[PDB]
Amino acid sequence: GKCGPPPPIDNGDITSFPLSVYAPASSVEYQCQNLYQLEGNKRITCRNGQWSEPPKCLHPCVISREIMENYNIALRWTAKQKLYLRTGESVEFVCKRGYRLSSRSHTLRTTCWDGKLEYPTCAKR
Amino acid sequence: DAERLKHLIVTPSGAGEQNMIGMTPTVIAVHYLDETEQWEKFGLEKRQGALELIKKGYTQQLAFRQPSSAFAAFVKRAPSTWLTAYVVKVFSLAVNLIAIDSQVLCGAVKWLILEKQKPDGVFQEDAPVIHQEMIGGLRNNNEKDMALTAFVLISLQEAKDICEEQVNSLPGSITKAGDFLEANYMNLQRSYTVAIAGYALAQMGRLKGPLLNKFLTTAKDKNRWEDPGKQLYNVEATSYALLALLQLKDFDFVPPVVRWLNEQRYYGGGYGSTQATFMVFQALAQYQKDAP
C-alpha cells in the first residue's frame, strides 16, 4: 500500500528529501520557516496508501509603528525593540501621554495569532 | 506596491470616532488594491480577512448610530455634522465591498440635509469631534464654512447614486450647497480650501471659467496644492485636487500631480493620518480607474 510524495505546506517543508513513492508505515516530518509556528502534528505517516493530515505554519505578526501612532499607543519596552511576534507571543502597550484606554478597546496586552494582532485604542482624556 | 502598505489592514477599535479612524485605512486599502488589482502578488488570501475587518468596523459603528440617524463618539453626546458626513463618505465607498444598510446611509444623508444645512447652503457643525486630528486640514481653518460645506457636499454627492431615490431632497440640498461654494470661491486664500471646494464643484460640473482658473493657478509648479504647516494637509489637499482634475477629465494636467503624490512616498497610517490616508488612495485608485 505504497503512497506518493508528501503534500506541500505554506511556509514550511519536509526535513528529508522527497521521494516519488513511500512504503507503507513510512513517515516524514515538517518544519516551518523562521518565526512561523507549527500547528498540528509535525509528523505524517503513510497508512493504506494515504498520508495523514499535514500541519500548518501560522504567520508571525509585524508590529506597525504607523498603527500605534494612529491609535495613540506605544511599546512598554522600547529598548527591547521587537519587530516581529511569533504566533502565541504577546506584547504590552501603554497609552501615549494625554490618552487613556478607551471604552471599547482590546486589553493593553495583546497576543499575535497567525499574522493578526489586535491593537488597543487609547482615547483623549 | 501593496507591500509598502500592508499595515493599513487593521482591526477597528474604540468609540464612535476612533472606530472610524481604524475602519478608515482598511476600507481604502481594499478599495485601492481592488482597483489596481494587486491581490494576486500581495495575497488573494489576505482579502477576505480584510473584508471582515471592514464588516466588523461597520457593525461596531452602528452602536453609535443615534435615533436621529446621526453619529457621535458616544450615544449621549450631541451628534457631529462632520462625523456623520464622514461615515457617509466611508460607507458610500464601501457599499460594493460589504453589505451596507441603505436606511443607515440614507438616514444619515437625510439628517444632514434636514437638520444641519443653513438657508444659504452652508453646513454647520454644532458638536465638534473630540479627536480633531481625524479631520485633516479642516482642523484649524479660517475658511471653515467653505471647508466644512465642501466636505459634507462631497459626502452627499458620493452617496447620491445610492440615496437619490430614497431621498428626494438630496439634489436640492446639493445644488444649494453648490451655490454657496461658487459665490465665495474666488475669495479663498488657503490652497486646502481651494482644492476641496474645487473637487466639490467639479463633481457638480460647476468648476469652470474663473473658478477653474483659480483652482489651477493656485497649485505650485503645477503639481501640488500646499499651505505652510502640516505636510499631511497638503497631501490631502492635492488628493482632492487630483480627483477634481479627474472629474474635469483634464488628463493633461494629471501626470505631474500624480507624480508628486507618488514622490511623497506616503503610505498612510500614523497620528492624524485619517483624511490623508483615505484621500490619497481614493485619488490614486481613481487615477487608475480613469487613465487614460
Swiss-Prot record, chain A:
Q: Where is the Sushi domain?
A: 1-59, 68-124
> Which biological process annotations from GO are given for this protein?
complement activation; cytolysis by host of symbiont cells; negative regulation of protein binding
Output the Gene Ontology terms for molecular function. complement component C3b binding; identical protein binding
User: Any S-S bridges, and between which cysteines?
Assistant: 3-46, 32-57, 61-112, 95-122
One Gene Ontology cellular component annotation held by this UniProt entry: protein-containing complex
Primary place of residence?
secreted
Alphabetized, the UniProt keywords read: Disulfide bond, Glycoprotein, Hemolytic uremic syndrome, Repeat, Secreted, Signal, Sushi
PTM info: N-glycosylated. Two forms are observed; one with a single side chain and the other with two.
Expression (tissue specificity): Expressed by the liver and secreted in plasma.
Where does it reside?
Secreted
Q: Describe the task this protein carries out.
A: Involved in complement regulation. The dimerized forms have avidity for tissue-bound complement fragments and efficiently compete with the physiological complement inhibitor CFH. Can associate with lipoproteins and may play a role in lipid metabolism.
The associated disease is: Hemolytic uremic syndrome, atypical, 1: An atypical form of hemolytic uremic syndrome. It is a complex genetic disease characterized by microangiopathic hemolytic anemia, thrombocytopenia, renal failure and absence of episodes of enterocolitis and diarrhea. In contrast to typical hemolytic uremic syndrome, atypical forms have a poorer prognosis, with higher death rates and frequent progression to end-stage renal disease.
Q: Self-association or partners: how does it assemble?
A: Head-to-tail homodimer and heterodimer with CFHR2 or CFHR5. (Microbial infection) Interacts with C.albicans GPD2; the interaction is direct and leads to the degradation of C3.
Q: What is this protein called?
A: Complement factor H-related protein 1
* Organism encoding this protein: Homo sapiens
- Organism taxonomic ancestry: Eukaryota, Metazoa, Chordata, Craniata, Vertebrata
Q: Gene encoding it?
A: CFHR1
* Parent sequence residues shown: 206 to 330 of 330
UniProtKB/Swiss-Prot annotation, chain B:
Give the position of the cross-link Isoglutamyl cysteine thioester (Cys-Gln).
15-18
Cystine bridges: which residues?
A: 106-163
Q: Which effect does the record note for changing residue 37 to A?
A: Impaired binding of C3d to CR2
Annotated effect of mutating residue 99 to V? In AHUS5; leads to impaired binding to the regulator CD46/MCP and resistance to cleavage by factor I
Phenotype when changing residue 40 to A? No effect on binding of C3d to CR2
Consequence the record notes for mutating residue 120 to N: In AHUS5; leads to impaired binding to the regulator CD46/MCP and resistance to cleavage by factor I
Q: Could you say what the effect of mutating residue 115 to A is? A: No effect on binding of C3d to CR2
Q: What is the recorded phenotype of mutating residue 289 to A?
A: Impaired binding of C3d to CR2
Q: Subunit comment for this entry?
A: Interacts with CFH. Interacts with CR2.
What is the protein name for this chain? Answer: Complement C3d fragment
Species this chain originates from: Homo sapiens (Human)
Q: Gene behind this chain?
A: C3
| Shown segment, full-protein numbering | 996 to 1287 of 1663
